[PDB]
Design a protein around this ligand. Structure first.
Ligand SMILES: [Cl-]
Ligand code: NA
Ligand code: NA
Length: 277
C-alpha cells in the first residue's frame, strides 16, 4: 500500500473542522493556510498549473481539478484554488495543452490533472505525500471547461462537479449524470446563452442527482471568474458544495437548502432539488 496520513481534524467520517458561519464561507479564505506547488507544462496529459493544499488538518483530503475555457489561461479560474484549499481540499488549477482545446479534450485533461495529484501523493519527495484520498474527487470548469467537467462526470466516478458558464455542443450523456452538480450560470451570457447551455444542462440531469442552478443577475460569460464581483457568494456555495459532496459533510446542507438565494438582487435565479440531498 501507499502511506496515507489520517485526518486529525475529522469526525463522523470525513467531516473536517468546525461548522462555520456564513460570513466565513463568504470570506476569501477558510480556516487553513494555503501552500502551493507549481506544476510545469511538462506534466503528463495537461498544460501544468498550480497545486494548492493545506496540512494543519492532516490527510484524507478530497482532490479537485479546475479548468479554464477556450482561448483562456489558469488565471481565469485560479480563485477556486486557494479558496477551496483553505477549506481542506487539495486543488489543482490548470492550463490546458493548448488554449484551443475543445470540451471533450478538456475533460481528459481534468482527469489527467486528478491523476497527477494522486501520483504526487505517492511520491515521498512531494509535500502532498499521503495527504489525499484518491477515492474522493471533484472538478470545476469554465465555459468549454464547464462542458468538459460535465462530460468527465459521465466517464469517471466524480463526487462533485461545478460547471461555470458551461458550453457544450452535440450529443451528450448529461441525462445520466449521478455526480452532484452545481451549475453557475451568468444571466446575460452571450457566449454560452443560458437558454441553450447552462439551464438546459441543469434540466437534463436526473432528479435524484443532487443539483443546483446558481444564476448571477446581469452576468456576462466571465461572471464567475477570478476577480469578478460574486466571488464571495459563488465561493460560499462552492465551498459548501464540495464540503457536502466530496467530504459527505452533512453539516453543510444547511448552507445550500432553504435559503431563497434569488431574493437578492445579485442572484437572478436559484434552482435546487434539496429534497434529494
Ligand atoms: Cl457575454
Ligand atoms: Na503537458
Ligand atoms: Na434576485
Amino acid at each position: 500500500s501507499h502511506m496515507m496520513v489520517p485526518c486529525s481534524d475529522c469526525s463522523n467520517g470525513f467531516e473536517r473542522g468546525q461548522v462555520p458561519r456564513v460570513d466565513q464561507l463568504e470570506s476569501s479564505r477558510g480556516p487553513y493556510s494555503v501552500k502551493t506547488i507549481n506544476v510545469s507544462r511538462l506534466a503528463r496529459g495537461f498544460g501544468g498549473g498550480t497545486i494548492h493544499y493545506s496540512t494543519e488538518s492532516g490527510g484524507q483530503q478530497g482532490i479537485i481539478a479546475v479548468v479554464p475555457g477556450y482561448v483562456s489561461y489558469e488565471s481565469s479560474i485560479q480563485w477556486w484554488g486557494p479558496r477551496l484549499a483553505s477549506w481542506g481540499f487539495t486543488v489543482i488549477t490548470i492550463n490546458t495543452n493548448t488554449i484551443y482545446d475543445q470540451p471533450d479534450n478538456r475533460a481528459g485533461q481534468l482527469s489527467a490533472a486528478i491523476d497527477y495529484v494522486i501520483d504526487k501523493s505517492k511520491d515521498r519527495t512531494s509535500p502532498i505525500y499521503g495527504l489525499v484520498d484518491p477515492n474522493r474527487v471533484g472538478v470545476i470548469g469554465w465555459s468549454m471547461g464547464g462542458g468538459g467537467s460535465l462530460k468527465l462526470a459521465t466517464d469517471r466516478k466524480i463526487d462533485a462537479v461545478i460547471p461555470q458558464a458551461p458550453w457544450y455542443l452535440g450529443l451528450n450523456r448529461f441525462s445520466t449524470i449521478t455526480s452532484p452538480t452545481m451549475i453557475i450560470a451568468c444571466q446575460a451570457d452571450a457566449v454560452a446563452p443560458v437558454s441553450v447551455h447552462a439551464s438546459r444542462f441543469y434540466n437534463q440531469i436526473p432528479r435524484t442527482t443532487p443539483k443546483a442552478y446558481f444564476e448571477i443577475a446581469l452576468g456576462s460569460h466571465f461572471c464567475a471568474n477570478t476577480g469578478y464581483p460574486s466571488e464571495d457568494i459563488l465561493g460560499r456555495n462552492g465551498v459548501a458544495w464540495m464540503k457536502r459532496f466530496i467530504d459527505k459533510d452533512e453539516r453543510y446542507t444547511q448552507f445550500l437548502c432553504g435559503q431563497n438565494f434569488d431574493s437578492s438582487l445579485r442572484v437572478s435565479e436559484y434552482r435546487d432539488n434539496c429534497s434529494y440531498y
